[model samples]
Target: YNSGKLEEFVQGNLERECMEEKCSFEEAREVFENTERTTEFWKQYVD
Candidate 1:
């Protein structure tokens, strides 16, 4: 998988599941930006 595809895949997954589960975009973006370790856990694959 390419780097660009990775982010799209993760976002799609997040939207389908997390959004359905009541995870707001602001929440997601905040969590992603605020937690250094957490971002490292998954952000590497971003485009």
Candidate 2:
């Protein structure tokens, strides 16, 4: 998922995770939101 496939991988996981009870897109997104990669990505973006 590191070779430009991250979005595709995340999109599929988000869809699948959202299908379960008590879960939605935001909840699925929380997984990434609370990660070091999230910070790293934003740092790269800002740079």
Candidate 3:
């Protein structure tokens, strides 16, 4: 995956999800973790 593209995409989606109540916190992590190969730095944002 393109590093910059992945980071941008993950960041944007994560911010978007934070505004919605449709998914629980655990579910949010699961969804984010699916892109585990992106970057560990980005994962910290989820934490």
Candidate 4:
């Protein structure tokens, strides 16, 4: 998210999807919103 790669990827998807009315834009939002609080999961490797 910080790098904005995810932004470009999502923005591109939304813009392209908007071209087709059938596109489920809400699902795209949900897909990105699916991230969780996994800091403890990654701490195992770095810490």
Candidate 5:
């Protein structure tokens, strides 16, 4: 079984960013990767 799972809150955030920046979902996703905010979210789930 998988130990970690996706967060709805982060999905809401990506959705918010998608609307706010007027971009696609994947594009919106790229903006958050490799950044402090991402680290903040990812720290708990190091793989």
Candidate 6:
């Protein structure tokens, strides 16, 4: 995440941007497999 000035520029995007949809296991799995949902969510929590 710490790449040049990108980390500082987009940290708020990770921390504040979020989704409200509640998904099932299969749906979540699909998201994990097909999207960056998990990493994007987790990146929000990192400093």
Say which candidate scores most in lDDT. Answer: 3
lDDT of 6 by residue, 4-36 (tens): 346467334533333553334455745457665
lDDT by residue (17-36, candidate 4, tens digit) is 45554566666644466466
- Rate residue 3 of model 3 by lDDT: 48
Model 3: per-residue Cα lDDT at residue 46: 55
lDDT: worst 10-residue window of model 5: 7-16
lDDT of 2 at 2: 47
List where candidate 6 sits over 4 angstroms from the true fold: 1-36
Q: Provide the lowest-lDDT 10-residue window in model 3.
A: 10-19
Candidate 3 per-residue lDDT over residues 1-47, each given as its tens digit: 55464554533354435446655666564566666565675677853
Candidate lDDT scores, in order, read 0.54, 0.53, 0.56, 0.53, 0.54, 0.53
The clash count for each model shown is 0, 0, 0, 0, 0, 0
The TM-scores, one per candidate, come to: 0.19, 0.23, 0.17, 0.23, 0.22, 0.19
The alpha-carbon deviation from the true structure for residue 29 of candidate 6, after best TM-score superposition, in angstroms, is 10
Local error of candidate 1 at residue 27 (angstroms): 5.9
Evaluate residue 45 in candidate 1 and report its C-alpha lDDT on the 0 to 100 scale.
70
Give one digit per residue, the lDDT tens place, for model 5 in 5-40.
Answer: 644334335333434656555556565764566546
lDDT of 5 at 32: 70
> Which regions of candidate 3 fall more than 4 Å away from where they truly are?
1-20, 24-26, 37-47
**lDDT agreement of model 4 with the native:** 0.53
Clashes of 6: 0
